[PDB]
Ligand binder design. Structure first.
Ligand SMILES: Nc1ncnc2c1ncn2[C@@H]1O[C@H](CSCC[C@H](N)C(=O)O)[C@@H](O)[C@H]1O
Length: 270
């Protein structure tokens, strides 16, 4: 295992949707002064040298003059790592959180790949808010929850290299939710095999967990990876409307020909 490297995919359309949603959840959590935890089970290397799927993702939005307000926090982090105006580095989920989180907040990050873990550690060598471990991310849903702050965003973002991930994300969410039922859980998934995503969502419904939102962006109709999504348990109350505001613009820029779709809907509605 562990042959996947996120550097091959960083900044693609999936990362754009994923990090849009991650950023909006973090900004909502920051509306209250009380600290919160950011927990990243499959954290990656931290930052990625781009120079090419990023050309069809982040490159198509980060310098647009009419950037929706819902993208400003995210795109400002991307600009922070590229102040020359040239697209050279892409900040992964840990660096988006590192820049958006406040002094009082905490980060718990895990990465198993033996070359990418040390790169991730280096990004946080002077940041006492963060802990970085070379450990199984699914175990952290038991070990690190609930946070003492009793507030948090948990991002579960595996590569689905091992087909066991389709079941492990549901089991892992169930274990995390048992320990921390008020947290916001954001699960990223690819659409390579639609029926396996339907199977996964069926298993998730069967847990009995309520308030489950689904955000999906497809660059092509169902048929490699044609789409990806974010399943969000306990979304901030504004998230659905924020996505209805921003998904049409996002899909039109990421997919100029109009193929595919961009939807927000409920798996388990209120
Ligand atoms: N069991 C496991 N525990 C922790 N990390 C794992 C894992 N299995 C695979 N990985 C790592 O999971 C990552 C998925 S890509 C993660 C990207 C990151 N969240 C971002 O948005 O920037 C890869 O870096 C891979 O090495």
């Amino acid at each position: 295992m562990l042959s996947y490297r996120h550097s091959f995919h960083a900044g693609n359309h999936a990362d754009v949707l994923k990090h849009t949603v991650q950023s909006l959840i973090i900004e909502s959590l920051k509306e209250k002064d009380k600290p919160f935890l950011y927990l990243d089970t499959h954290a990656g290397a931290g930052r990625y040298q781009l120079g090419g799927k990023y050309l069809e993702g982040i490159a198509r939005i980060w310098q647009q003059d009419d950037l929706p307000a819902e993208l400003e926090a995210y795109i400002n982090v991307v600009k922070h790592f590229n102040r020359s105006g040239q697209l050279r580095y892409y900040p992964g989920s840990p660096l988006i959180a590192r820049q958006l989180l406040r002094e009082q907040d905490s980060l718990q990050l895990t990465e198993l790949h033996p070359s990418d873990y040390p790169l991730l550690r280096s990004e946080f060598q002077k940041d006492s808010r963060a802990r970085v471990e070379k450990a199984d991310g699914f175990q952290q849903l038991k070990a690190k929850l609930p946070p003492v702050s009793r507030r948090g965003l948990i991002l579960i973002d595996p590569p689905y290299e091992m087909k066991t991930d389709y079941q492990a994300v549901v089991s892992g969410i169930a274990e995390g939710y048992k320990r921390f039922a008020t947290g916001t859980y954001a699960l990223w998934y690819p659409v390579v095999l639609r029926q396996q995503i339907k199977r996964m969502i069926h298993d998730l419904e069967a847990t009995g967990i309520r308030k489950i939102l689904q955000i999906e962006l497809a660059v092509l109709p169902d048929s490699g990876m044609t789409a990806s999504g974010m399943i969000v348990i306990n979304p901030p109350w504004k998230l659905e409307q924020q996505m209805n505001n921003v998904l049409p613009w996002l899909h039109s820029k990421l997919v100029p020909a109009g193929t595919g779709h961009a939807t927000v809907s409920w798996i388990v509605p209120e």
